[PDB]
Structures are given as C-alpha cells and as structure tokens.
Structure 1
Amino acid sequence: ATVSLWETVQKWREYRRQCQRSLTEDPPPATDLFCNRTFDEYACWPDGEPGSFVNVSCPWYLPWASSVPQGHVYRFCTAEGLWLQKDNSSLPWRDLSECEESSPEEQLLFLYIIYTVGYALSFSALVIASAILLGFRHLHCTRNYIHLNLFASFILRALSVFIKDAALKWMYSTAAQQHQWDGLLSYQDSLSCRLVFLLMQYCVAANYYWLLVEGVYLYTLLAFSVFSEQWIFRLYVSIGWGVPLLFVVPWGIVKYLYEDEGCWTRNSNMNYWLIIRLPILFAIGVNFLIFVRVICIVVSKLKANLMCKTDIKCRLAKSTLTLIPLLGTHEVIFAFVMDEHARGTLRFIKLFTELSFTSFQGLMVAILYCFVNNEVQLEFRKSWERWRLE
C-alpha cells in the first residue's frame, strides 16, 4: 500500500468527527475544579481531575500509529485546575516524545512539472497553429474546420488543468502540519472545488469526442458517397461539443444530490464514475477500429502500385507513425495499463504518469498537421514572394 498526506488528512476528518461526538456526548464529572476536556489539532483529551496527568492513547490518524501502539501523549494540569503552561506563556505543556517520528509526495511533484511543461508547450504551439490556419483564406476546407475544432478541444483541456492546479495550491502544501489540514478540508468540500472539477471533466470528454470526430470523418471520406456538406458539418459539430453534455451533467447531478463531503472524487462503495469513464472507452475503441481499417486501405493501395520489398515497409512505417497522433491511438495501451479500482495516492500517481506522456499529443498534432504540411509551406512561400517584390 501507498500512503501520503492525502490519506492522513482523510483519516483526520473521521477522528475529528468521532472526537466531536464524544466531547458533545460525555457527561461532566460530578466533582469540581476539573480540568476542561478539549480537542487540540494533534489529539483529543478527556476531563482530568486536578493534580494528575492524562493517559491517552496515541492518535490512530497518524501514519505511524501502528508501529508503536503503546505510546501515550501526556498533558498535565496542576491541582488548581488548569493545564500546565510551558515557557514564554505558550500552548500548555505536553509530552509528545512517546510516539513520534523517495516518498509519494516527491514522485507526484516531479510528474506535475513534466505534465505542466508539456501542456504549456502544447498550448503555445496550438495557438500559433490556429492563427496560421484561420489566417490564410486559401486553406478553408471542411477537414480544416475539423482540425480547428480539434485544436480548440486540446487548448481547453490544457487550460482546465492549470485552473484546477492553481486554485488548489497542493504543491506548496505537500508538507502541511495538523493546523494546515483544517483549511485543506474546508476548500475540498466547497463549491468552487466541485465546479472546477466538473469543468475539467467536461474538457477531457470533449477532447476525446473530437479525436473520434476526426476518425469518423476520415472513414466516411474513404468509404461513402458524397452527402450534403452542411447537414454533415452541423451533425459533426453537434457530436463533438454536445454529446459530452449528455453524460457529464447526469453525473454532476447524481454527485451533487447523493454526496455531502468531498470534491467529487471516486466514491467509496458505489461506482458513479462509470457515467464518465464508460463513454470515453467507447469512443477510444471505435477510433481504434477506424485506425485499423484505414491502415488496411493504405496497405492495399501500396501493394497495388510497383515498389520494392522494403520501400513498402518504409512508407508504411512513416504513415502509421504520422496517424497515431490524429486518432489518439496510444489511449488503448494507456487504458489497458490503468487500474480502475485504485483510490487515493496510487490513483494519483498512475493518472499523473499517463498525463505526463499524453500532455505532448497537442504538440505532436500541431507540428504534423500545420507546420510541415505541404500546403502551409506553399502559402508561406507565396506570401513571402509578394512582399519581396514590393
């Protein structure tokens, strides 16, 4: 098992709840001058009769609570009925030496750096490429409208991750103490957190459905008779941008109705997460079938012509390498490797490694379909000649 500050704070909440109930349920002692019973962030202490110490068990929410189940934090209140103050009139004296004491926090922090750098390169390249394809009016096709909508989905996905990471400053808090935990929990069960999470989910799903729109349009070019060019464009834009909403708002409704705490992370017993994960896998699988059929087409067209025994393979390899980025073919591997029953730190480590590799899909697409594209080079030359004549 892997544990981090995540699981420690999540157990702290349950400890606090039980402690609050006990404090609110414990009858007061019959005697007087008793030392008042309070919950400090570190531990919960009961009432103590004056002139004696308190023998409390080591709190179970600590990661090292199982190493020594024999320690006892000690706090003393004098015979007058007040806790013993320590030096410089500070928090009352307590004995913490009984039970006290690379990591998952470090791993997650490095993956975040690689994924942020990749998304930031992808964002910049896709903005340049959208400028280039929208600018020139000779490059106005239907396939270039599909490409612009795909670029838009990539850019929205990158922009959503930055907001989620910047709104909850987890990287700075990776070493927070007990006091800092209260705040962390307060933001998690707020409404800003839940709606920022919902926005990120929508942007992920919309990107996936624009790599299926790409695939379905190429397939219909290679296997179908020409049909109305507006009745197909409206249908494609509708599928790309508004089919995600048919399973992202039902998920956001069930989560909002049937949950009190948390920022809508994966529930404990029930599995609501299938409302999002299941259509994503459907799109990924259909787009894999499209990939295989298109490559079969290229192989027959390549065998029919006259080439060597090796030039066939060279051109086939180059074409397959150039088509993995457009249809997102690697997501079939990355969905095979991912464990769908992991929760907490393990889930975050797995997710971040996939994001670390797949953050640079937008950069690959931008280079392959806008910077080395032959027509784009052609307009750069033609535009340059008109200025050089002047």
Structure 2
Amino acid sequence: VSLWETVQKWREYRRQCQRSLTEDPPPATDLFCNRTFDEYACWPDGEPGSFVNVSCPWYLPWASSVPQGHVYRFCTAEGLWLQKDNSSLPWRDLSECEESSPEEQLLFLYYIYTVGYALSFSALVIASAILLGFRHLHCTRNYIHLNLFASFILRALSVFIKDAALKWMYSTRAQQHEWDGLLRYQDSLSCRLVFLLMQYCVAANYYWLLVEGVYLYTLLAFSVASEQWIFRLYVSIGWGVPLLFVVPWGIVKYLAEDEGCWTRNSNMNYWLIIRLPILFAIGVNFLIFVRVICIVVSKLKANTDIQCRLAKSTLTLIPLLGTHEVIFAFVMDEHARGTLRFIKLFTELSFTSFQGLMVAILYCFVNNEVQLEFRKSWERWR
C-alpha cells in the first residue's frame, strides 16, 4: 500500500471517467458550463452560481479513510469556472480531504544494494582479467569459472540499466499529479524489452551456477569426461536453456496482455513460465551442495580438529553454488505482488548484491595459485 497502487487506481479512474465524460448526458443551452478533467477530478457539467460539494476522487490514498471528500468549482454564470483572487489559473479546493517513515526504507535500501552491485562489478571484472591469459595457467575448471563470472557481470549490468532507464529513484515523492509520462513510459516501447532482459540475465545467472555444480559432480563421481564434448554441452546449456523458457513467456505476454508493464499479474497468475525453472535449478544446486559436503567430509576423515577446519571449506563453497538463494526463495515468495513484493524482493536483492564480491575474492584472490602468480612474476619484473 503506497503510491504505486495510487497510480494504478488513478489510471483506472481516468479510464472510467474518460468514457463517462464521453457519454455523459448532453444539456440544452450554454448557460451551463462544459465538462472537463483536471488530473484531480473528472469535472462534468454543472449549473453556475453554485459549487458542487462532490467527493474528491476515491483513488486518493486517504480517500479510503474519508467518504467526505469535497472539492468545489464556481462556474461563473458570466463564463468559465473560478480563478483565485487576482490570479489567472483555475481555482480549486482541498480543504477537507487532505492527509513515521512510510517508505523511505525503499530508497535507503535501494542505495544500500546499488553500492553492493557496484563493488561486485568492480571485483569480478578484475578476477576475470587475471584468468584471461595473464596467469596463462587455465585448466577446464578455470574455464568454467571464467564463464561463470560473466553471469554476475550481466546480472549487475541488467539491474543498473533497469534502475537507470526507469528513472524511478527521484520521482518517488511526486506529490503533484504529473503522472502522465509515468504511465506513458509503461508503454510497450522499452519496459518490455528491458524487463525481459533483466529476467533472462537473472535466469542464466542461476543456470550457470547449476552447470557449475554439475561439472563439480561429473568430475568427482562419474569419473569420466569423454573429450571437450562435455564442455561443448555445458556452455551450450549455459546460455541456451534459460532462453528456451523466456521467449515463450514473451509469446504469452506480448499478444496476451494489453497496455501496462505487466509487473507480474494478469489476475490469472501467469508468472510461472519463468520462475518455475529457477526453483528447479535452485533445488538441483542445493542437492549437489549436499552431496559435495558429504564427499569432502568423508575424504577429510584421515590421519575435534574436523569441524573447525570444515568451516573454512563450507564457507568457501556457499558462494560458489547458490546455497544462499534457497533461504530467500523460502522467505520472500508470495502468491501476490504489490508494494510488499517490491520491499521484500529488494531486501533479497540487497543481501544478494554482495555475493558477487564473495565469489571473486574467494576463487581468484586467496587460493595458493593466484597468489603464486604474483609471487613469481615480481621475481621477473624487479
């Protein structure tokens, strides 16, 4: 319950009052004013000499708390409606149907996670720059990791492009009804493609964690890897599978639902075609995590010194897979959208923004080999 539903209800109110002012009863003679709409009340015909203590529109966030809204207008029998004393603009009133920290939460945490994505995009690109050819010791595990990084890269890129092109950060307190372009931006020109893009990227970012888990498995249990054929399969299912079930989602929406950036509702629950396989991939990665922790804790049974050392391993493994995401998927989900959806999803996206940093710093900056690169190349420079 916030300004978002207010914009929506206002759009429906305009939708209705427009057809009303269209097909309202016509009068006989000109001694009665015209019918207009001033972004604040669909002003129909009225007799001069008097105001009309009509209810100020119901779309107001406080209207639900006031049946006694009353906005007036004095159609001058000698002409138009009223203008203020000595002014030239048309006169109105709000005397009675006017109105902590309601939603500042939203903007604060928006900044809180954009800082995090910024850090992650800074770190992962350097991690990748290391592993391109400069280390020049790049096995197939290195190749899979180097290609995993691109997932986080594109995810952060998409989030940034989305927040930018929406330009929503600074209109959050648009008190005055200048909502024309806002709805005019929710037309099928951009919101469509940009949102589909952010969806495809955030899906590929889970499938790549999945294929990474699969490769960690088929190297450890199946014991075989025929040729480069296995990698030709893996990178193929990397950026190919997520594209398989989002373009159908487009086939659904573009011809199925008219104006309105769909924002996950058509009052028929159409939002499964994308999110179901995401939960699928999360489940797969989670099971793989369990099996790998079992394998490791077995192989460690050699030689009270177990757990204390097991932690330094399982903490390294969490960001590698997506084992963090399962908790959010277990707490944030809800069968309905709304402001609660945005708030919860953004808290998720805040605590999630950081695990771009963690992977980069744990799998290219702290192992023995990465440090050994510098430890040996300083010994050639100076």
- After TM superposition, is the score higher than 0.5? yes
Question: Aligned equivalents of 2:182 and 2:202: distance in 1?
Answer: 25
Instruction: Give 1:221 shift.
Output: 1.0
- Contact 2:159–2:198 at 8 Å: present in 1 too? yes
Q: Out of 141-150 and 221-230, give the one that drifted further.
A: 221-230
CA-to-aligned-CA distance 1:271-306 (integer Å, 9 cap, x gap): 22101110000000011111111111111111243x
Q: Out of 268-277 and 156-165, give the one that drifted further.
A: 268-277
Question: Aligned equivalents of 1:16 and 1:290: distance in 2?
Answer: 53
CA-to-aligned-CA distance 1:176-227 (integer Å, 9 cap, x gap): 1343211111101232111000110011001101111110101111101322
CA-to-aligned-CA distance 1:237-264 (integer Å, 9 cap, x gap): 0111110011010001101111112222
Question: Aligned equivalents of 1:384 and 1:371: distance in 2?
Answer: 16
Instruction: Give 1:102 shift.
Output: 4.2
Question: Aligned equivalents of 1:375 and 1:98: distance in 2?
Answer: 72
Instruction: Give 1:379 shift.
Output: 1.3
- Contact 2:186–2:261 at 8 Å: present in 1 too? yes
CA-to-aligned-CA distance 1:47-72 (integer Å, 9 cap, x gap): 11222212311210001002220231
Instruction: Give 1:114 shift.
Output: 1.2
What pairs up with 1:5-84 in 2 under 5 angstroms?
5-84=3-82
Instruction: Give 1:104 shift.
Output: 4.6
- Contact 1:9–1:181 at 8 Å: present in 2 too? yes
Structure 1 unaligned segments of length 5 or more: list them: none
Instruction: Give 1:355 shift.
Output: 0.5
- Contact 1:23–1:37 at 8 Å: present in 2 too? yes
Question: Aligned equivalents of 1:340 and 1:67: distance in 2?
Answer: 27
Structure 2 unaligned segments of length 5 or more: list them: none
Instruction: Output the aligned Cα RMSD.
Output: 1.3
SS at match of 1:75: coil
* Aligned residue number for residue 166 of structure 1: 164
Q: Establish whether residue 364 from structure 1 lines up as the match of residue 362 from structure 2.
A: no
SS at match of 1:210: helix
Q: Out of 68-77 and 48-57, give the one that drifted further.
A: 48-57
- CA change 1:49–1:252 in 2 (3 A) is same
SS at match of 1:33: coil
TM-score, length basis structure 2: 0.97
Question: Aligned equivalents of 2:35 and 2:246: distance in 1?
Answer: 47
Question: Aligned equivalents of 1:16 and 1:316: distance in 2?
Answer: 62
- Contact 2:208–2:238 at 8 Å: present in 1 too? yes
Instruction: Give 1:339 shift.
Output: 2.8
Q: Out of 157-166 and 81-90, give the one that drifted further.
A: 81-90
CA-to-aligned-CA distance 1:96-141 (integer Å, 9 cap, x gap): 1021124453111011111101100000001111111113253211
Number of aligned positions between the proteins: 382
- Contact 2:257–2:266 at 8 Å: present in 1 too? no
Question: Aligned equivalents of 1:135 and 1:89: distance in 2?
Answer: 72
- Contact 2:135–2:373 at 8 Å: present in 1 too? no
SS at match of 1:237: helix
- CA change 1:104–1:352 in 2 (3 A) is farther
Q: Out of 22-31 and 84-93, give the one that drifted further.
A: 84-93
- Contact 2:211–2:234 at 8 Å: present in 1 too? yes
- Contact 1:51–1:81 at 8 Å: present in 2 too? no
Instruction: Give 1:85 shift.
Output: 1.7
SS at match of 2:98: coil
SS at match of 1:173: coil
What pairs up with 1:179-190 in 2 under 5 angstroms?
179-190=177-188
Question: Aligned equivalents of 1:130 and 1:337: distance in 2?
Answer: 33
- CA change 1:375–1:213 in 2 (3 A) is same
Percent same amino acid among aligned pairs? 98
- Contact 1:119–1:360 at 8 Å: present in 2 too? yes
- Contact 1:49–1:81 at 8 Å: present in 2 too? no
Q: Establish whether residue 292 from structure 1 lines up as the match of residue 293 from structure 2.
A: no
Q: Out of 52-61 and 356-365, give the one that drifted further.
A: 52-61
* Aligned residue number for residue 90 of structure 2: 92
Question: Aligned equivalents of 1:25 and 1:97: distance in 2?
Answer: 30
Question: Aligned equivalents of 1:115 and 1:137: distance in 2?
Answer: 32
Instruction: Give 1:32 shift.
Output: 2.5
- Contact 1:123–1:158 at 8 Å: present in 2 too? yes
Q: Could you say which structure has the higher helix fraction?
A: 1
- Contact 1:212–1:287 at 8 Å: present in 2 too? yes
- CA change 1:22–1:190 in 2 (3 A) is same
Q: Out of 133-142 and 286-295, give the one that drifted further.
A: 133-142
